[PDB]
């Protein structure tokens, strides 16, 4: 004889179907993350890492590193050809 | 005063005099209504707490 109780029965009722499914996905995606640009890790110098933080950086990454690599390759090849040819 | 040869006004007067206590009033809404209400506030506070923490989340 008791009336229905919508706001009293919300323990099992969630927000539709998709919103409750994505609530767990969105609650923790924003929890454990850097606030703003933390840990840049820019500093690196290990020849390969020296190239990474010197010319191979993605801020520009223009053809200048490629031209420098080609210049070094042809400089080595000149001596190689002198040895061979 | 309207009736002269009544012969019945005393009988009806006595009948109403003996009829006013018809029976004891029930006033016993305290066996299933009380249990329904107890469950009502219990799980209602539970739902209030859960919706509150969901809002904070």
CA–CA gap between residue A76 and residue A49 (Å, rounded): 22
Q: How far is A17 from chain B (nearest CA, A)?
A: 16
The number of C-beta contacts closer than 8 angstroms across A and B is 19
Q: Supply A85's token pair.
A: 């040819």
CB-CB contact of A15 with B51 (8 Å): no
Q: Which residue, among B57, B48, B56, has the nearest Cα to A24 in the 3D structure?
A: B57
Please indicate the experimental technique that yielded this structure: cryo-EM
Resolution, rounded to a tenth of an Å?
4.0
Q: How many CB atoms lie within 10 A of CB A46?
A: 9
A80, containing H or E segment? helix A64-84
Contact A65, A57 (CB under 8 A): no
CA-based nearest residue to A42, from A32, A56, A28: A56
Preferred mutation among A2, A20, A27 to probe B, highest tally of B CBs within 10 A: A2
Q: What is the DSSP string of A34-70?
A: -SSS--------SSHHHHHHHTS-TTT--SHHHHHHH
């Amino acid at each position: 004889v008791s009336t229905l109780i919508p706001p009293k029965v919300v323990s099992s009722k969630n927000i539709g179907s998709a919103p409750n499914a994505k609530r767990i996905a969105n609650v923790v995606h924003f929890y454990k993350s850097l606030p703003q640009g933390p840990a840049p890790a820019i500093k690196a110098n290990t020849r390969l890492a020296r190239y990474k933080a010197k010319y191979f950086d993605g801020d520009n990454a223009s053809g200048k590193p490629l031209w420098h690599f080609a210049l070094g390759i042809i400089a080595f090849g000149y001596s190689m050809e002198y040895y061979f040819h | 005063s309207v009736l002269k040869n009544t012969s019945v006004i005393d009988k009806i007067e006595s009948y109403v005099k003996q009829y006013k206590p018809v029976k004891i009033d029930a006033s016993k809404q305290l066996q299933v209504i009380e249990s329904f209400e107890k469950h009502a506030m219990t799980n209602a506070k539970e739902t209030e707490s859960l919706v509150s923490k969901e809002l904070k989340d």
